Write a protein that binds this ligand. Structure first.
Ligand code: HEM
Ligand SMILES: [Fe+3]
Ligand SMILES: [Fe+3]
Ligand SMILES: [Fe+3]
Ligand SMILES: [Fe+3]
Ligand SMILES: [Fe+3]
Ligand SMILES: [Fe+3]
Lengths: 158, 153, 158, 157, 154, 158, 158
């Protein structure tokens, strides 16, 4: 089942976005582990695994549509110096991913191909709830708990 | 008929309490306060069970439960505000329930009275819990209380 | 209930397609078992059962729309005289079915029938992934492997 | 190898079985849609059994080096009410049993005894698991009353 | 978007009204002794409250204010056939509102809430089918037989 | 523990190599799954998970030495068009990885930095035994079984 | 298996260093238990047991090489006054132990004594990961969490 060249290009943009997200989440999780924030490292590593799964689903969809999937392309990373900066960067990138996802879903609706719309809606749901929601929750928690208390909770057990 | 009207008013307050507790629990989970959100979810569920018992009691009395009406919801913008709003709603609950229990005793009606008495027991327990929560907020600081209310990250 | 005439007609068309597919895979699985290709016959039979289930979902939906399920009509079967012809005919039928399904999904969205659209999206996902993909991959394998090696693999245990 | 007459008889019986399967499918779905769940489960099981019987028949036709015509399907008598469905199923089953008896006689004449054994199994199923049950159902719709029978067919609310 | 949040609040109000109506109907079914119908109505109520939980979480995640204060007019039946008819009519209104809201959410390219509302619409259509079938069963098998079936075990 | 700039630089080069390898194996496994070579797909997925573990170890080492992991950089990718081409490309990349790892181990020994040397020796062990051995065996088996028999072996169950 | 006398001398120096580390860690663990810091108490007690295990390894190697262990000799104890001072003192002693271990590993390489080098690399890994990494994490967590929150985490359940 050949896909539209526009659908393939938008799926390649989504794939490079998801690969960049996985790479940035990898770096952030490993930095959190280095600083000793154990529970934050667990959560961010699980999010990285989810992003690898998202990239795999996207590349399977691209190959199914007989389009060559580009994974060499990587977007510029936003590595934060401290925990609040890292989570602000993660929230910003997840919002950009959400916007690109919504554009791709609209394109899939226009181009009459609906299995890609289904997988992209699944990806959008995961990005909005599993990733975006947790990040905005944590930014609000930094605001409310305070930096010292939030880092105490993130460190977990010493 | 007076006992039925009093029971309907108690039911209206209990429905309002259900709505307020559930909405507060959902807001707390939206903000990330998992322990506080879980406790408020449990409190809403207990009030749902209480409303279930009171609807059973009203129907047993061949009355018409008034599930249409609902009291005003005191919705808080931050956790201490929702704590004190729950406390104020529970205080109104306690006053109304005491009046209802006295009325039920006067009318020689005793089964709805022991139902209202157990309801008053849970209501006073919740009143104590919320007053203690407010005093704890003051004692440990809002930052520490919110850290505890978050629970595990 | 009170489903649109166009929606009900499209559903009836999709149903005729599903029933014809059921019959075709039935025949094919039986002669695949007859030829000794058990490891292929099992897959074809499972797919026929899947087709039966799909047609069931379709009929249930048509009945829930206060329509008359046309289970009488049937298209022209395409029975292969050899496993490659079998798989090619299956792929062709599934591709035609996918086209019809996409058209029906577009109609269901246009007529604001979202439950039928959900059902059809499920059916299209199953037909694109579980069927069309498998048939395409089989047609590719019976070419990368060679007819002899592929039939040896399809026979499984002698 | 298999005789022409025997293969034709088998194809006729197969067309019959496929039509019956489609009818049972339709009726089970309508019975489920109407809320009769017990009757629906019974008819669905019956449709599955019909599918199994058709499978056996197709396997037989293919073993006899013939061509199983599944493209064809006989006239379909659908019911509007549960009694109508029951009567239609019974009629179809009676016709099928008659054709089966004829086919068994033909297979005996042509000395095709394995095919005859298969057809005898099919006739036993169509006479016991189907025709008997449907005759019983009609009798029960007559004796219980339409309302009571439909209540029984609805199962539990 | 403001219109999407308003539509979500309207669907939430419909769901809360349905919750109250279903629970009340279950309670009077149990009061009359219709244990099986009461259990089904109780389960339907619980599912509507789970749906309202999902809708409230969606409204909050959209940075909106859920309106749990409002409630529609409770149609309360004097007998079981009237209960089923009222439930079906309320589901009719809810389904029309759901279809319009899904169309609106599709228009604004807000797809997560559209998927949640698609789930809600699937459950609502199933409820339509169940109540229409129950009314048709009442007509077919007689009110007395249907009430005996609703009682189940005495 | 401050880390020497040369060890940090060679660790970053090795990290870029392992991340490029992870992307290459991910793509190769995905198109192998697309082609129905499930055995090869499973093995290459396992290899890419091992590559992820290698990248994680390298990033942990870089972070411990107070270095900045250059995770945004990705080397050139060689994507094959058929199974022998993937085997050859993976083999060539693995020989490059072995050469770079050997140079990095030499530098780590020369620069007194022994824990990183042990980590890199472990990486070299896994690279030459789990990856290079498998790919050399794979090229030999394609030569000996022939393309058709090897592709049948790779396909497995059909 | 008499070894190089210089290897025995550096092994004796390392053994004295580990014995002094065990003494200092014992005092610090008991002080942490005395102040009510149970979490730190458990971690430091386990670290003291690990120092005892390393001393066992070193003494077994020394006796194997026909050398007289220098167990009587001890280094000066850098005992802290509060928790940050105790952690900083432990970290400084562990860093010095790491430097001594690196010098000894280099000497063992120079003397072609590879089994002692193996045990020294094992000790260096355990000192640079199980001890130094945790101590620098604790210092950073004191800085980030603040002293009051860090001490609350250290105390644990009360
Ligand atoms: C207005 C009158 C209501 C009554 C009488 C009522 C009653 C009940 C009862 C009896 C339960 C069973 C709990 C258990 O057995 O564990 C329950 C659970 C629940 N209720 Fe309510 N409820 C009401 C309103 C609501 C509302 C408005 C919501 C949400 C917006 C809600 C959300 C829930 C949820 C999520 C559960 C848990 C479901 C489960 O555990 O399976 N309820 N309620
Ligand atoms: Fe993602
Ligand atoms: Fe604190
Ligand atoms: Fe072979
Ligand atoms: Fe009866
Ligand atoms: Fe690697
Ligand atoms: Fe030591």
């Amino acid at each position: 089942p050949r896909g539209s060249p526009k659908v393939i290009s938008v799926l390649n943009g989504l794939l490079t976005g998801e690969l960049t997200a996985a790479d940035q989440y990898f770096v952030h999780a490993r930095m959190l582990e280095n600083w000793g924030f154990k529970v934050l490292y667990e959560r961010i590593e699980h999010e990285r695994h989810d992003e690898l799964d998202h990239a795999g689903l996207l590349i399977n969809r691209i190959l199914f549509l007989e389009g060559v999937p580009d994974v060499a392309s990587r977007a510029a990373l936003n590595i934060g110096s401290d925990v609040p900066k890292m989570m602000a960067n993660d929230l910003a990138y997840e919002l950009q991913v959400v916007d690109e996802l919504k554009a791709a879903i609209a394109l899939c609706e226009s181009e009459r191909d609906y299995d890609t719309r289904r997988i992209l809606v699944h990806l959008l749901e995961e990005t909005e709830q599993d990733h975006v929601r947790w990040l905005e929750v944590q930014v609000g928690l930094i605001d409310k708990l305070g930096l010292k208390n939030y880092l105490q909770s993130a460190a977990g057990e010493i | 008929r007076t006992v039925l009207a009093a029971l309907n008013d108690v039911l209206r307050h209990q429905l309002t309490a259900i709505n307020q507790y559930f909405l507060h629990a959902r807001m707390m989970k939206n903000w990330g306060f998992n322990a506080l959100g879980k406790h408020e979810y449990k409190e809403s569920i207990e009030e749902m069970k209480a409303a279930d018992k009171l609807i059973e009691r009203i129907l047993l009395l061949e009355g018409l439960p008034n599930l249409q009406d609902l009291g005003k919801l005191l919705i808080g913008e931050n956790v201490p505000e929702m704590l004190k709003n729950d406390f104020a709603m529970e205080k109104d609950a306690h006053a109304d329930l005491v009046k209802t229990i006295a009325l039920c005793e006067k009318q020689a009606d005793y089964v709805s009275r022991d139902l209202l008495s157990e309801f008053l027991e849970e209501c006073e327990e919740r009143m104590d819990f919320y007053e203690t929560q407010l005093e704890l907020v003051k004692k440990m600081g809002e930052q520490n209380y919110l850290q505890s209310a978050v629970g595990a990250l | 209930x009170x489903x649109x005439x166009x929606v009900x007609x499209x559903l009836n068309x999709x149903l005729x397609x599903x029933l014809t597919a059921x019959x075709q895979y039935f025949x094919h699985a039986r002669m695949x078992x007859n030829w000794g290709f058990x490891x292929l016959x099992x897959x074809x039979x499972x797919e026929x059962x899947x087709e039966x289930x799909x047609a069931x979902x379709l009929i249930x939906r048509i009945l829930x729309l206060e329509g008359x399920p046309x289970x009488x009509x049937x298209x022209x079967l395409x029975i292969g005289x050899x496993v490659p012809x079998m798989x090619x005919n299956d792929x062709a039928x599934e591709x035609x079915x996918x086209x019809x399904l996409x058209x029906x999904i577009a109609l269901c969205e246009x007529x604001x029938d979202y439950x039928x659209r959900x059902x059809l999206x499920x059916x299209l996902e199953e037909x694109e992934x579980x069927x069309x993909x498998x048939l395409x991959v089989x047609x590719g394998x019976x070419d990368x492997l060679x007819x002899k090696n592929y039939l040896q693999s399809x026979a499984x245990x002698x």
